[PDB]
Design a protein around this ligand. Structure first.
Ligand code: NA
Length: 129
């Protein structure tokens, strides 16, 4: 599924990401834009041979199992494939654990490089939430 901006904002809010660990909704929508372009089916191979999955590009090195990332953990206890669903529940539940890990949203290098410190409220402009 390719989400609309406001469509994704609404889904993340419903799932309690708005101001989760103090990150306003625009931060999450901004991260998803630059990680996935709002595409649940996005996959990207990392240099270390781990893979990033879904709207928030969650890494197989720590968070999900893909059966092909030697020495990896599955701290969200999910197949990485669950992170590609049109239903963002698994991505969101896993993202709550990641952002709670101690480095907050810096875990998402694209958030740190492209969203951090910017006018992230612009990402929810116009949305009926
Ligand atoms: Na893994």
């Amino acid at each position: 599924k390719v989400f609309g901006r406001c469509e994704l904002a609404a889904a993340m809010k419903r799932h309690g990401l708005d101001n989760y660990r103090g990150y306003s909704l625009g931060n999450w929508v901004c991260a998803a834009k630059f990680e996935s372009n709002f595409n649940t089916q996005a996959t990207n191979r990392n240099t270390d041979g781990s893979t990033d999955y879904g709207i928030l590009q969650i890494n197989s090195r720590w968070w999900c199992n893909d059966g092909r990332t030697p020495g990896s953990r599955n701290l969200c206890n999910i197949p990485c494939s669950a992170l590609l669903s049109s239903d963002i529940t698994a991505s969101v539940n896993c993202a709550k654990k990641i952002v709670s890990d101690g480095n907050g949203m810096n875990a998402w290098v694209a958030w740190r490089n492209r969203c951090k410190g910017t006018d992230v409220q612009a990402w929810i402009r116009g949305c009926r939430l």
